[PDB]
Design a binder for these strands. Structure first.
Lengths: 76, 31, 115, 174, 135, 50, 188
RNA sequence: GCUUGACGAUCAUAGAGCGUUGGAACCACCUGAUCCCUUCCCGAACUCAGAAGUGAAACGACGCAUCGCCGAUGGUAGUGUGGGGUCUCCCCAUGUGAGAGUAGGUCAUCGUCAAGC
RNA sequence: UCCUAAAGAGUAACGGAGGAGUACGAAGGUGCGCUCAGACCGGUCGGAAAUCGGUCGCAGAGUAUAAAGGCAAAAGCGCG
C-alpha cells in the first residue's frame, strides 16, 4: 500500500552520436538489452554495452531484416 | 458387471476419418 | 522445403560469423546428385575461385559419391592457390560435417588450402 | 503384405479410380501416434515400464515415453511427468502388419454393427475398431495384469475425402 | 452512474483538457445530437441526470445513444486533513469534454421533440452545448 | 549457500573460494582449475574453510 | 451544381487562417489520378449553400477556376468540430473512364406501410445511411432506394437485401462485410 | 542474350493469396540401406550408395490489386521565438509542421561465380 | 524497475505502482541439433481440458525471480 521507493537512474542512452570520431575502446551506447545492435567494428559487452573495437566515426545504420538499428564504425 | 470402463477418445472418429482435426496418417512414431 | 529452410537456418550462424571476422569463405552445396565448392571473399558477395563436380573434366556418371567430393577437394585447392588465398574458413552450409562434406574439406585441406 | 495386389493392381487401380493425371499423388502411407494414455494413475513411475514392455513385443520395436506439457492441475497432477508410449511399423514393416490386421485377426472382441456410415468429414473415412489391449500375437492368458489400449486412424497423404477413402481399403474390408 | 468495470490503476494525474474534439464530433449512430461547444467536465451523475431527462421526455420510443464515458477517476482530501500525506482516495468519475464532443444522440423522434428533449438534457449539464443534425 | 574453499591438489597452499548448497549437493567438488603457484590446471578438492 | 473558384498561390497555416478570418474564403484542392493537384480558394457562403443540398456529395459539380471549367466530385470534407462549417473542401477530378467511389445516402422510402409497424408494434432503426459505392460517373445515384415495406418485426435488412441500380458496386459487399442497413425492433 | 543453381546487396512498392507453366541439363521428390552415420523410438530428419521413374508435393518463372504494405498534394493538430487576450484556455506575427485519411502505387530492383541455350 | 520526467543525461514530493537482502556445479562454457504457445475438432473412465497426428498457423510461449528494455546467430529448448 504505502509508496516511496525509486532507484538510482542508471544514466543510460547514446553516448557518441552519429558522426563522431571514436577511439578503440570508447563506450558507444549504454543499453538495457540491445536497442542498438553491434555493427562493423563495435563490440557488445556483458550488459549489452556497445563499445568500439577500432577507430573511425559512428554510423548508426538501420540495416537488414528484423528492422534492427546498428551502430557501426566506419574507418574514415 | 457395469463397472469396467474403456477410455479411448482420439481413436474415435469413425475409424480412419482422415484426421480428427490433426492431419497425418498411418503409424505411431515421428520416426 | 521444410528441409532446405531448416538447413539455411542451421547454416546462418556460421555464415553470419564469418562476415563478422572478415574471413574468406569456402562454401559447399551438396545436392543429392552432386556437390559444389566455392570460394567467396570476405563480404559475401564476390567469388574468388569456384570448382564444381560439373566441371567438364570430371563429369563421369558416377558423380556424386564420397570420391567426387575428394576430387573437387584438390580441384578447388589448386584453383584457390592461383587466386592467392590461405587462412580460409570452411562453411559446411548446414550440412553435417561427416561424409562428402568432410571429404571435400579434407581433400581441399590436403592441397595446402589452410582452414 | 503390400505386394502383387499393390505393385500391379492398386497403384494402377487408383490412377483410373480417382482419375489422377500422373502417378505420385496416389496416396502413400506414413505416420500417426497411438497416444496410449497411461496418465491413469499419473504419479506412478512403475507401470510405464510395464506399458513399454506391453507395447514392445506386440510391435517388435522400442517406444519412447511421451511427457506432459503443461501443469493442468484440475484433471490430474503435474509431477506425473512420464505419461505416453509410441511405435510406428514402417512401410517396410507394414507388410507383415497389413496381413495381421483385418486378415485373420479382425474379431477383436465383438461388434453388432461396424458400419461405414456415420462420419462425413471431408478427409476419407473407414470403419474398424480397437478397444482391447490383448488382440495381437504373443500375449498370455495371464502373465502381467494388462491394462492398455492402442489407437490407429488413417489420413490421406493426399488431398481430400473421396480421394482418400479408396486407397485406404485393400481387400473386401468394411 | 457510469463507471468502468475495473481499471488498470486507481488514481490518475490531474492532467489538462486541451484541443478540439476531432474524434467524437460526428453524429455517427443517431439522427440528432447534443454537441458540446465549450470544454469542461461531466461527472457521471450529470451524465445520468441528463440521460434520465432525455429518456423521460421522449415518452414514446426512440433510441438514445450516450456517447461520453467517464473513465477518469477524481480524488478528494476529506476535511480536517493536513495536506501531503499521500494522495487522497477516489470519490467519483469524470469524462473530459472538449468543444465539439457529441454527448448524446437520438433517432426515432421528430426534430421538434428532439430539440426540446436536448433542451432538458442541456439544462442539467455544466457545459455550453448545441443541437446538430446528421450531415 | 554457505561458502566453501577449493584447495589445489598440487603441493601448494593455493585456494579458490566459492559457495555451495549443502542440502542439495552434499558431495564434494572435484573441478579442474588453474593453480597460479605451479602454473598448470589441476583438480581442486576441498571444503571446511576453518 | 456549379461553384466558382480561384487560384490560391499562397499555402500554409497562417495563410489559411487569414483566408478564413479576413477574406471570408475557404481553401481547397482539386486532384485526380491524371493531373497535378491544384490548390483553390472557395467562398464559405457559396459552398455552404451546396452543402444544404441532399444530393450534394453524390453528384457532378462543375467547377470554374478561371475560364477553365472542371467536373468535380466532392471526395473529402473538413469541418470545424465545435461550431460546424466548412474548412478546406478537398474535391476530386472526374473522368468518364474511372472507378470513382463516392458516398450515397440511403432514403428509406415507405416506412408507414411496414408490417413490423402497423400490425406488430415496432419501430424502424436506421443504423446506416451514406453508403459508399463504386461507379462510373455516367451512373451517379443521388439517392439509393431502400424499400422497407415487406419487412416484418424483428427482421433485419442487410446490404445484400437491397438493389444496386444499373451497375453500381456497393463497396462493403465486395468484401465479406454485409452490413446491417436498417432494423425493425420492439419499442421501449 | 535467356534458364537453373550457389552466394550476397536491400528488407513488404520485395509479402500473403489465387491461377498458368517448368524436367534435358539443374534441383526437388524418388530406390535401397549392406557400409560410414542417426533416431529421448528413425533410413519420414541426419547419412551413404545410386539412376529405375515423377515434376504430384516442394521450389522457380510468368499473371492478377480483392488482402497486406507503401503513399502524395492540400488542410488540420502540435510547436521555437515575439506580442496579445475574455488566461484552468486560445489568438496574432514569424519559422516549422505531423499522425490519420484521400487520390494514387506495388505481384520488386540489383551484383559475383558456375554450368547449359 | 516503471511513471511523474518536459523525445540526450539528470530531476522533487509523507506523489503514483510494484520488488530485492537471492538462487545455480548447472540454471556456467562449448559443439551439434530443435521451435513455442493458441483456436480447431476428436468421444467406450479425463471430455473445455492431459497422451499425439498437427490443418490453419502468422511470437500471444518461454526466459530462476519485480518491472522495463530485449531475444532466429534466438538470449528460448534438448543432447554430448
Amino acid at each position: 500500500t504505502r509508496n516511496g521507493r525509486d532507484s538510482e537512474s542508471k544514466r543510460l542512452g547514446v553516448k557518441l552520436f552519429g558522426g563522431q570520431a571514436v577511439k578503440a575502446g570508447n563506450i558507444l551506447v549504454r543499453l538495457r538489452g540491445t536497442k542498438f545492435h553491434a555493427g562493423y567494428g563495435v563490440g557488445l559487452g556483458k550488459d549489452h554495452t556497445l563499445f568500439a573495437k577500432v577507430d573511425g566515426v559512428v554510423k548508426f545504420e538501420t540495416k537488414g531484416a528484423f528492422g534492427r538499428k546498428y551502430v557501426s564504425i566506419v574507418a574514415a | 458387471k457395469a463397472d469396467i470402463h474403456p477410455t479411448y477418445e482420439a481413436i474415435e472418429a469413425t475409424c480412419s476419418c482422415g484426421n480428427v482435426i490433426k492431419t497425418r496418417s498411418t503409424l505411431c512414431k515421428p520416426i | 522445403s521444410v528441409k532446405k529452410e531448416t538447413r539455411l537456418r542451421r547454416a546462418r550462424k556460421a555464415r553470419l560469423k564469418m562476415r563478422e571476422l572478415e574471413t574468406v569463405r569456402l562454401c559447399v552445396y551438396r545436392s543429392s546428385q552432386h556437390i559444389y565448392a566455392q570460394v567467396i571473399a570476405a563480404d559475401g558477395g564476390k567469388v574468388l575461385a569456384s570448382a564444381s563436380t560439373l566441371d567438364k573434366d570430371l563429369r563421369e556418371g558416377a558423380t556424386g559419391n564420397i570420391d567426387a567430393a575428394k576430387k573437387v577437394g584438390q580441384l578447388v585447392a589448386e584453383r584457390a592457390k592461383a587466386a592467392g588465398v590461405t587462412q580460409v574458413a570452411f562453411d559446411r552450409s548446414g550440412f553435417k560435417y561427416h561424409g562428402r562434406v568432410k571429404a571435400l574439406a579434407d581433400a581441399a585441406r590436403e592441397g595446402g588450402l589452410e582452414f | 503384405r503390400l505386394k502383387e495386389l499393390y505393385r500391379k493392381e492398386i497403384a494402377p487401380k487408383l490412377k483410373e479410380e480417382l482419375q489422377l493425371a500422373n502417378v505420385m499423388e496416389v496416396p502413400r502411407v506414413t505416420k500417426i501416434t497411438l497416444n496410449m494414455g497411461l496418465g491413469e494413475a499419473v504419479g506412478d513411475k512403475k507401470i510405464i515400464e510395464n506399458a513399454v514392455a506391453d507395447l514392445e513385443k506386440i510391435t517388435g520395436q522400442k517406444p519412447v515415453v511421451t511427457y506432459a506439457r503443461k501443469s493442468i492441475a484440475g484433471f490430474k497432477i503435474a509431477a506425473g511427468w512420464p505419461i505416453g508410449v509410441k511405435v510406428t511399423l514402417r512401410s517396410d514393416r507394414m507388410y507383415e502388419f497389413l496381413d495381421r490386421l483385418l486378415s485373420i485377426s479382425l474379431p477383436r472382441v465383438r461388434d453388432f454393427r461396424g458400419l461405414n456410415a456415420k462420419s462425413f468429414d471431408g478427409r476419407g473415412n473407414y470403419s474398424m475398431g480397437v478397444k482391447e489391449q490383448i488382440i495381437f500375437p504373443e500375449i498370455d492368458y495371464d502373465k502381467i495384469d494388462a491394462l492398455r489400449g492402442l489407437d490407429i486412424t488413417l489420413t490421406t497423404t493426399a488431398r481430400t475425402d473421396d480421394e482418400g477413402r479408396a486407397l485406404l481399403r485393400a481387400f473386401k474390408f468394411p | 452512474m457510469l463507471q468502468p468495470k475495473r481499471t488498470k490503476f486507481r488514481k490518475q494525474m490531474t492532467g489538462h483538457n486541451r484541443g478540439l474534439a476531432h474524434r467524437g464530433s460526428k453524429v455517427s449512430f443517431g439522427e440528432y445530437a447534443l454537441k458540446a461547444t465549450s470544454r469542461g467536465r461531466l461527472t457521471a451523475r450529470q451524465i445520468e441526470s441528463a440521460r434520465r431527462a432525455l429518456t423521460r421526455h421522449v415518452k414514446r420510443g426512440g433510441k438514445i445513444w450516450i456517447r461520453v464515458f467517464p473513465d477518469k477517476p477524481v480524488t478528494k482530501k476529506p476535511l480536517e486533513v493536513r495536506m501531503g500525506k499521500g494522495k487522497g482516495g477516489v470519490e467519483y468519475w469524470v469524462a473530459q469534454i472538449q468543444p465539439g464532443k457529441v454527448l448524446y444522440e437520438i433517432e426515432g423522434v421528430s426534430e421538434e421533440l428532439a430539440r426540446e428533449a436536448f433542451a432538458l438534457a442541456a439544462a442539467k449539464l455544466p457545459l455550453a452545448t448545441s443541437f446538430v443534425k446528421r450531415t | 549457500r554457505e561458502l566453501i574453499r577449493l584447495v589445489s591438489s598440487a603441493g601448494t597452499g593455493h585456494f579458490y573460494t566459492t559457495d555451495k548448497n549443502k542440502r542439495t549437493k552434499p558431495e564434494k567438488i572435484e573441478i579442474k582449475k588453474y593453480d597460479p603457484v605451479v602454473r598448470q590446471h589441476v583438480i581442486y578438492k576441498e571444503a571446511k574453510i576453518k | 451544381f456549379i461553384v466558382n473558384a480561384q487560384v490560391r498561390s499562397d499555402l500554409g497555416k497562417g495563410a489559411s487562417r487569414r483566408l478564413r478570418r479576413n477574406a471570408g474564403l475557404v481553401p481547397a484542392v482539386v486532384y485526380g489520378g491524371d493531373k497535378e493537384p491544384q490548390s483553390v480558394t472557395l467562398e464559405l457562403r457559396e459552398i455552404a449553400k451546396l452543402l444544404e443540398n441532399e444530393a450534394a456529395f453524390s453528384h457532378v459539380i462543375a467547377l470554374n477556376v478561371g475560364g477553365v471549367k472542371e467536373t468535380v466530385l466532392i471526395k473529402a470534407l473538413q469541418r470545424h468540430p465545435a461550431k460546424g462549417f466548412v474548412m478546406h473542401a478537398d474535391f476530386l477530378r472526374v473522368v468518364a473512364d474511372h472507378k470513382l467511389t463516392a458516398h450515397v445516402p440511403l432514403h428509406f422510402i415507405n416506412e408507414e406501410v411496414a408490417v413490423g409497424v402497423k400490425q406488430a408494434g415496432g419501430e424502424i432503426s436506421h443504423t446506416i445511411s451514406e453508403v459508399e459505392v463504386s461507379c462510373l460517373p455516367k451512373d451517379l445515384p443521388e439517392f439509393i432506394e431502400v424499400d422497407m415495406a415487406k419487412v416484418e418485426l424483428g427482421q433485419i435488412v442487410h446490404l445484400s437485401d437491397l438493389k444496386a441500380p444499373k451497375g453500381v458496386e456497393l463497396v462493403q459487399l465486395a468484401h465479406g462485410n454485409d452490413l446491417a442497413v436498417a432494423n425493425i425492433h420492439a419499442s421501449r
